[PDB]
Design a protein around this ligand. Structure first.
Ligand SMILES: CC(=O)N[C@@H](C)C(=O)N[C@@H](CCCc1ncc(CO)[nH]1)C(=O)N[C@H](C(N)=O)C(C)C
Length: 305
């Protein structure tokens, strides 16, 4: 149909503090969740079946991300480290040390030979996956780094910060290519590249999402109607059915917009706290959503469209 009809299929309980992030494995089999409870949990994407707990961080986790081959995870923790995990064994392969404050955000490149991280220490770091060594420290921002993401060929990194900036970095040199958003305020709470790498989706803590043309440095679309003044809420491109933008909201709902028209096409009700994180299944019309401390659950929603 022209609009989605997402309906609740499963509620995934087990975290003992706020959930911080959910991400589907690229092969579609798994959902990974991270939590302030210091744990990663792995769940079946299709039936919500609890698979395993992955443990080792000494403080809460803000983010987790999958390698391209679905075999590895990287997590970002308040313990000032990232950890690379073998999903099959649950073992920590590498501990990435160098940040001087909470690690907030992380991602693999498409090649999955590099990890990018952002920290409360106001830096972006680029790490070698094989050795766990820090290759580059970028003095990226002047306040905590809220998001980091590689583009589809891995040649670019986009970063965002509470300093109000969005910057694009040349991966190879670590040098800045452009400052896409250059305001004192509001905080830029989330950024990522579009699937094709031509656009950047950016959240600001004034209840606004924007789709930017990277090359032209111009705003193409604005999405509003949700509540986002405090938390670094993820946003997604939904591409399996209709072309949507998806985001959590501080009114405890999942918002779904038509990417082209900017109209709200669905609001998913059921969580009892802020929806901090949403993820879109790579092949099926499935959304995962996760909520803060009142709720501490993940919900799986399925649409015909
Ligand atoms: C472990 C922890 O909570 N660390 C502090 C520093 C924190 O505030 N982390 C944030 C992480 C939000 C999720 C996120 N990761 C990456 C993005 C976008 O790139 N968004 C938070 O709101 N935590 C919640 C809070 N402060 O209430 C909960 C999960 C404790």
């Amino acid at each position: 149909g022209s609009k989605p009809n997402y309906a609740l299929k499963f509620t995934l309980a087990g975290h003992t503090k706020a959930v911080s992030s959910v991400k589907f494995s690229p092969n579609g089999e798994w959902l990974a969740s991270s939590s302030a409870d210091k744990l990663i949990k792995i769940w079946g994407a299709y039936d919500g079946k609890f698979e395993k707990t992955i443990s080792g961080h000494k403080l809460g986790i803000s983010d987790v991300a999958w390698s391209s081959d679905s075999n590895l995870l990287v997590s970002a923790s308040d313990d000032k480290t990232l950890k690379i995990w073998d999903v099959s064994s649950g073992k920590c392969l590498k501990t990435l040390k160098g940040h001087s404050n909470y690690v907030f955000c992380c991602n693999f490149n498409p090649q999955s030979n590099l990890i990018v991280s952002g920290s409360f220490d106001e830096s972006v770091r680029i790490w070698d996956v094989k050795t766990g060594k820090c290759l580059k420290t970028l003095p990226a921002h002047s306040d905590p780094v809220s998001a980091v993401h590689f583009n589809r060929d891995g040649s670019l990194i986009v970063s965002s910060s509470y300093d109000g900036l969005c910057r694009i970095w040349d991966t190879a040199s670590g040098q800045c290519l452009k400052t896409l958003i250059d305001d004192d305020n509001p905080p830029v709470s989330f950024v990522k590249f579009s699937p094709n790498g031509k656009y950047i989706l950016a959240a600001t803590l004034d209840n606004t999402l924007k789709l930017w043309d990277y090359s032209k440095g111009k705003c193409l679309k604005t999405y509003t109607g949700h509540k986002n003044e405090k938390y670094c809420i993820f946003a997604n491109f939904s591409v399996t059915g209709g072309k949507w933008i998806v985001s959590g909201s501080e009114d405890n709902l999942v918002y779904i917009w038509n990417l082209q028209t900017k109209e709200i096409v669905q609001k998913l009700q059921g969580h009892t706290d802020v929806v901090i994180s949403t993820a879109c299944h790579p092949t099926e019309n499935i959304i995962a959503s996760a909520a803060l401390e009142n709720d501490k659950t993940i919900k799986l929603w399925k649409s015909d469209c």
